[PDB]
Design a protein around this ligand. Structure first.
Ligand SMILES: *[C@@H]1O[C@H](CO)[C@@H](O[C@@H]2O[C@H](CO)[C@@H](O)[C@H](O)[C@H]2NC(C)=O)[C@H](O)[C@H]1NC(C)=O
Ligand SMILES: *[C@@H]1O[C@H](CO)[C@@H](O[C@@H]2O[C@H](CO)[C@@H](O)[C@H](O)[C@H]2NC(C)=O)[C@H](O)[C@H]1NC(C)=O
Ligand SMILES: *[C@@H]1O[C@H](CO)[C@@H](O)[C@H](O)[C@H]1NC(C)=O
Ligand SMILES: *[C@@H]1O[C@H](CO)[C@@H](O)[C@H](O)[C@H]1NC(C)=O
Lengths: 153, 248, 595
């Protein structure tokens, strides 16, 4: 059954895939690179390419190759971020709040640069390790057993 | 297509303009069930199922929710909660000829009725009585399909009528087949209630200077309010000023 | 499951196959009748053989269905109309003998050629030779010679063949649970299983006899007036009957040829809009368009365009030969055409309107299954055609469409001439139809001995019709078989029944149209109520008993000539006034051959 169809190292192609509200969205970025082992330690943006009103409950994936290298796969967490839009709206830098306390300070101060000082970020809270229910004794049992163990009925 | 072998086409990921068809004025029947033809023109759907076939004139009324008859039971059935439309136009010059247009067939016998959106192609010899058919016609054994008789002389209820059922699907997936979204010429340097793909702002539009990104649609201010809009018709940015006002 | 459901499904499949097969046969017949070629005859034979084989196979496969356990009226009617074996009820030898005798007698009638003793080579057929001789020429000797030769060289040959055909028909009707083949033909009007509408075969005889008895005074006065007018005083006694050959035809069926000899007022011009039609440049297409406009005016739906693109209205040149006989082709599967060689005449105007009424009736019951896509009986469709032609023949209709100029006046003398001509056309053959049908009934049932057959005929000819043979004929003659229907196995009561039906329908329409004045001046133009009332029975066709349709139209479930009496009441009074000095009736004893 077909319900949809569409047709459109020296280089690194990066992609982000996510399904939200039945819309599958892909954000791509092709960049020139000069390295062969690991991801460059720099910064770049990802702009959207395709959104599809498919909503197929996608849970698994696998890459496809043609038989006549290496690649990297991460995962996405629901994090809070701060982004620095430049003069013409190009994402120049970003900070993840959950990374470390300094990052949390940057997030809560709305600035990539934080003036020297003391700053409150959150409120440490100790959650209940478990729950305990306490009641008096249950000694006062009703004569259900006598009906159960009734010799004469 | 034949009515028992009605052709289903799935339509999605495109703008559907029902206005031209509803206003083409070349059709015998136009019955949109549950939705006005003009209203559905400005309406979106995930899928459109076009079921095309040819029936007699008297069979056209059989193509409706909650209807009976040989066509409505053995050839094709419409659900009671039918939200689409039924369109029908004569094809006497198209699907009839002198001598009889016999290519079309209609199912007349079946062991049971048809489910909604169900197509029956089985040619099993229907057994009216108890005599086994054994693949051939005899006593109490007759072919489920009868050839349509279409000639340019036939009566109004007997002419070949092409009927397409447009069933509209709004499933969990987001809507794909929508309407033209009738655009309007825009103005500038004037207090105008503007709408750009749902922004529905109000104010004055002026020529902008800032440059958007190719994937970008509209701007925003530090206070998180709409300030700039790229025109969807032609790719250029326009600044937005709120409608002039003040104290007196 | 049940036998009734299996029979219904079998009838449905039979209709499915019959649609295509009969459509192919009808299109081949139309091609042959528009172009007479050898290949047309070949495909005619192929289609006829295929259709006959299919009908016989379906009849055999349906006869095993018992009709007594079937409660559906329409299904039972379809099964009884399909299972009618007919002549096949006999053995193959007897059936083929009957078919050969029928073919031989039809060939003798069609090729009946008489030669004058003056020139043995100079021979003429009945049509157009003898019919014109005894219809236009007024020479007593020539008409007598033509009549005697036609009944001699054909009757003598046909008498043994006709006797054998009669006995074979009687034995097959007996094998078909009929007392005689006359009862077999009367079974067409038979209605069973309907409360308050059942009709019996003997009821047909009773109704025909009663209607003829009612017409007897009017026919006696008309015969007296015609005899007084007749042209041939020496050979026609004023008290005696009329010669058979001096009635405009061999059998005296139609006396319209005597109209010139029996015109009430010769100085009064006859109503004919042919000259104005020529002035208005009306042709076959224009006449058909005006007729369609008239049919729409009464409320009937607009007629199809495939008719115009397929039907033949004029003579298709001379390269191809086409049948000029007026026919309304109901080819099936919605195919309706009219085959005519239409000229610019008022007669062709009326004939085209008659054929279009036929086509409207055919398309009315087109929604019925194949077995029910026919008229109620042999006299229903012709009644509709005749009433449509008569409505088209009214002076009001002609004046409304401009064919008859407004300055034309309608006087009593012109009305009397029109009524008398209509009488000679219609009621002239009613006594002849009654007597011939009674003779056929008695011949099939066997009351009339062979050595008395002709002796019986000329008896009632002098009594029922007041017609006397100019020269005596013995039993070697087969004068009844000299007619088309007797020599071709066709029921002759159909004309009397269709006359009664058309009079009843015309009177009912005029009552529904609220006509003011004489019945012969009644025009149903611009009367939607009359058209709707007619359609209420046209669509039924034969899906319902004809008695029910007759009740729905005229309020009477049975035949009656009261509409005929209303139509001819001015003419009846005029004839009674004229016959004050002319003996009314006839004398059976007197004959031209006895002095
Ligand atoms: C717009 O983004 C680009 C990417 O860094 C830069 O473009 C410069 O500025 C304008 C375009 O806005 C143009 O003169 C050139 O595209 C760039 N300048 C020069 C001298 O080449 C810049 O960062 C952004 N634009 C501005 C004005 O800052
Ligand atoms: C939508 O259609 C309009 C009408 O053609 C387009 O306007 C023209 O577009 C072409 C090329 O796209 C230009 O060469 C013309 O100059 C445009 N017309 C005018 C008056 O300027 C419009 O471009 C289309 N929309 C998009 C996004 O291409
Ligand atoms: C996706 O899965 C959820 C539960 O896991 C279910 O409720 C929903 O109907 C599914 N939708 C589709 C389109 O598979
Ligand atoms: C009676 O009480 C004893 C107490 O342990 C229990 O084990 C036994 O199942 C009871 N039997 C009945 C019949 O009540």
């Amino acid at each position: 059954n077909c319900t949809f169809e569409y047709v459109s190292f020296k280089n690194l192609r990066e992609f982000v895939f996510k399904n939200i509200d039945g819309y599958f969205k892909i954000y791509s970025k092709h960049t020139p690179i000069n390295l062969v082992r690991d991801l460059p330690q720099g910064f770049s943006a990802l702009e959207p390419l395709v959104d599809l009103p498919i909503g197929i409950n996608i849970t698994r994936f696998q890459t496809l190759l043609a038989l006549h290298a290496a690649y990297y796969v991460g995962y996405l967490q629901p994090r809070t971020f701060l982004l620095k839009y430049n003069e013409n709206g190009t994402i120049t830098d970003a900070v993840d709040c959950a990374l470390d306390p300094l990052s949390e300070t940057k997030c809560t101060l709305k600035s990539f640069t934080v003036e020297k000082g003391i700053y409150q970020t959150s409120n440490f809270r100790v959650q209940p390790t478990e729950s305990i229910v306490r009641f008096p004794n249950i000694t006062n049992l009703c004569p259900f057993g006598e009906v159960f163990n009734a010799t004469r009925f | 297509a034949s009515v028992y072998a009605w052709n289903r086409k799935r339509i999605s990921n495109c703008v559907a303009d029902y206005s031209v068809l509803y206003n083409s004025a070349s059709f015998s029947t136009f019955k949109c069930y549950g939705v006005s033809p003009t209203k559905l023109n400005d309406l979106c759907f995930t899928n459109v199922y076009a079921d095309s076939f040819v029936i007699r004139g008297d069979e056209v009324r059989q193509i409706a929710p909650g209807q009976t008859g040989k066509i409505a039971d053995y050839n094709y059935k419409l659900p009671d909660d039918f939200t689409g439309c039924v369109i029908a136009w004569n094809s006497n010059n198209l699907d009839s000829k002198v001598g009889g247009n016999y290519n079309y067939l209609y199912r007349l016998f079946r062991k049971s009725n048809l489910k909604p959106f169900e197509r029956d192609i089985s040619t099993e010899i229907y057994q009216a009585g108890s005599t086994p058919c054994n693949g051939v016609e005899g006593f109490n054994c007759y072919f489920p399909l009868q050839s349509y008789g279409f000639q340019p002389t036939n009566g109004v209820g007997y002419q070949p009528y092409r009927v397409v059922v447009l069933s509209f699907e709004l499933l969990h997936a987001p809507a794909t087949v929508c309407g033209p979204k009738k655009s309007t010429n825009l103005v500038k340097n004037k207090c105008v209630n503007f709408n750009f793909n749902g922004l529905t702002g109000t104010g004055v539009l002026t020529e902008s200077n800032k440059k958007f990104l190719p994937f970008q649609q509209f701007g925003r201010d530090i206070a998180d309010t709409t300030d700039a809009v790229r025109d969807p018709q032609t790719l250029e940015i326009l600044d937005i000023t709120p409608c002039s006002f003040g104290g007196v | 499951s049940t036998i009734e459901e299996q029979a219904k499904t079998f009838l449905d499949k039979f209709n499915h196959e019959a649609e295509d097969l009969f459509y192919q046969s009808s299109l081949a017949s139309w091609n042959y009748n528009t172009n007479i070629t050898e290949e047309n005859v070949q495909n005619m034979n192929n289609a006829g053989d295929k259709w006959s084989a299919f009908l016989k196979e379906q009849s055999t496969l349906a006869q095993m269905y018992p009709l007594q356990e079937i409660q559906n009226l329409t299904v039972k009617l379809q099964l009884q109309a399909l299972q009618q074996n007919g002549s096949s009820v006999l053995s193959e030898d007897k059936s083929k003998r009957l078919n050969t005798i029928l073919n031989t007698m039809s060939t003798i009638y069609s090729t009946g050629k008489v030669c004058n003793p003056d020139n043995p080579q100079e021979c003429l057929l009945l049509e157009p030779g003898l019919n014109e001789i005894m219809a236009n020429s007024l020479d007593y000797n020539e008409r007598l010679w033509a009549w005697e030769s036609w009944r001699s060289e054909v009757g003598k040959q046909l008498r043994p063949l006709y006797e054998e055909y009669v006995v074979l028909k009687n034995e097959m009707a007996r094998a078909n649970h009929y007392e005689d083949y006359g009862d077999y033909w009367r079974g067409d009007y038979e209605v069973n299983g309907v409360d308050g509408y059942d009709y019996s075969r003997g009821q047909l005889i009773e109704d025909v006899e009663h209607t003829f008895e009612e017409i007897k005074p009017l026919y006696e006065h008309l015969h007296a007036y015609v005899r007084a007018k007749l042209a041939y005083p020496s050979y026609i006694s004023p008290i005696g009957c009329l010669p058979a050959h001096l009635l405009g035809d061999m059998w005296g069926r139609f006396w319209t040829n005597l109209y010139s000899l029996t015109v009430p007022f010769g100085q009064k011009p006859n109503i004919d809009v042919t000259d104005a039609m020529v002035d208005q440049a009306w042709d076959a297409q224009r006449i058909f368009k005006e007729a369609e406009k008239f049919f729409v005016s009464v409320g009937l739906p607009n007629m199809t365009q495939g008719f115009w693109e397929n039907s033949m209205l004029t003579d298709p040149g001379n390269v191809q030969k086409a049948v000029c006989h007026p026919t309304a082709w109901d080819l099936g599967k919605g195919d309706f055409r009219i085959l005519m060689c239409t000229k610019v005449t008022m007669d062709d105007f009326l004939t085209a309107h008659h054929e279009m009424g036929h086509i409207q009736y055919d398309m009315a019951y087109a929604a019925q299954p194949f077995l029910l896509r026919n008229g109620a009986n042999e006299g229903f469709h012709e009644a509709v055609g005749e009433i449509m032609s008569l409505s088209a023949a009214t002076p009001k209709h002609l004046k409304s469409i401009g064919l008859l100029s407004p300055d034309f006046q309608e006087d009593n003398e012109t009305e009397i001439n029109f009524l008398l001509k209509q009488a000679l056309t219609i009621v002239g053959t009613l006594p002849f139809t009654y007597m011939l049908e009674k003779w056929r009934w008695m011949v099939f049932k066997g009351e009339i001995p062979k050595d008395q057959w002709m002796k019986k005929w000329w008896e009632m000819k002098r009594e029922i019709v007041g017609v006397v043979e100019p020269v005596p004929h013995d039993e070697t003659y087969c004068d009844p078989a000299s007619l088309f229907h007797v020599s071709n196995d066709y029921s002759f009561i159909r004309y009397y029944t269709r006359t009664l039906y058309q009079f009843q329908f015309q009177e009912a329409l005029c009552q529904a149209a609220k006509h003011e004045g004489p019945l012969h001046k009644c025009d149903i133009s611009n009367s939607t109520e009359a058209g709707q009332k007619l359609f209420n029975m046209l669509r039924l066709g034969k899906s319902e008993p004809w008695t029910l349709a007759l009740e729905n139209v005229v309020g009477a479930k049975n035949m009656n000539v009261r509409p005929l009496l209303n139509y001819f009441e001015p003419l009846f009074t005029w004839l009674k006034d004229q016959n004050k000095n002319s003996f009314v009736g006839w004398s059976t004893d007197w004959s031209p051959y006895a002095d």
